[PDB]
Symmetry: D2
């Protein structure tokens, strides 16, 4: 985990994120998207639970990206929750929630759910 | 948002979290739980999209908590995605994803989904 | 369960559904909504697992509503997954997924997630 | 849709389901699983919204399976929400929610979320 998490990851839709896993569970980095009301790089921050593992389990982690930078303000944020699996073909399998700021009447339709798999290749 | 987000929040199951919303979209603080394989305070980190709003919309945000501290290591992490609504009865309405580290065979049953509403009272 | 499930249920946003729980796990009825690109009554069909319970557990169930009737065709469908709890204040607590038909490019943003609590009152 | 939906579908984990899409939005069939506290065939019932489409969109649908049959009673039910895409490589992309009957104290951890892609091959 940690060392193995640090680096560049890519998902099936063309997004990329670079992250550094800190010794004490922190995850800091940048996310550059391919889809959405996104344009360029956004700051990401998260945590991972290591001290993950004598039975080859994945390392649980999660991170958040607020979709605001100097070129775009999408009034939304996405959180990814999943686990890191290392080795030959290391990957981070996740499920995500994207919430957009709405008025109280439309709050019932403010959150989208999806999944993403990231690889080092 | 920000100023209004900073402070202590409580949810329906008895959990509490104290957070500081930084000028540039950061959210840092601690989460003390009431349920789970949790015991005491855990570090939380997240982001919010302000620059939220001429039509009274909520401010989108998200945060992560890795369930590891000096007393417990639950090998899991939770991410909350939702929005902040301020005023008299300010609240943060969220949906969350809790992923536990599993072996590849049980990865299909590694993530729980739920919702939480936090208030200042 | 079953007998206790049969009847009219109402949720916090003003929607109502009438359902009949059949002896062999079937759920059939109609849903009349309050929100969305919905207008009038829609057919609902689902299943419940009874034979639910010596430790006062809820009865798991789920149902689907395709949002098409003689007055509206929203090109979407919602599924609710949750459990029935009977007694004085019987309720059905659920989480739902609403998927809209999209082109392949927008499939990543086709599903909304939410929760609903239904009561007999 | 409908005609194209009728038939046998398989997912990445080895489960199979046979379904008949009825002229008026009904979906009826059987699901045979590969994973879980499942064993053999279970009844499935659902709905689809056709009258789906001059811009090649998918057809929204959803179905439910209560995990009880003559050999197993798992006290749980799963609902799948997604869309059907036809053609050469027709597929049904879905997100699912699996709720297990729990006591009120553990209701917060009663629902799992995941995704499944089904193909005709």
């Amino acid at each position: 985990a940690e060392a193995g998490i640090t680096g560049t990851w890519y998902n099936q839709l063309g997004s990329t994120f670079i992250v550094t896993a800190g010794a004490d569970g922190a995850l800091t980095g940048t996310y550059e998207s391919a889809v959405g009301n996104a344009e360029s790089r956004y700051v990401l921050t998260g945590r991972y639970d290591s001290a993950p593992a004598t039975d080859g389990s994945g390392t649980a982690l999660g991170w958040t990206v607020a979709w605001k930078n100097n070129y775009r303000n999408a009034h939304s944020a996405t959180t990814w929750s999943g686990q890191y699996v290392g080795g030959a073909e290391a990957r981070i399998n996740t499920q995500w929630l994207l919430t957009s700021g709405t008025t109280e009447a439309n709050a019932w339709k403010s959150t989208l759910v999806g999944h993403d798999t990231f690889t080092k290749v």
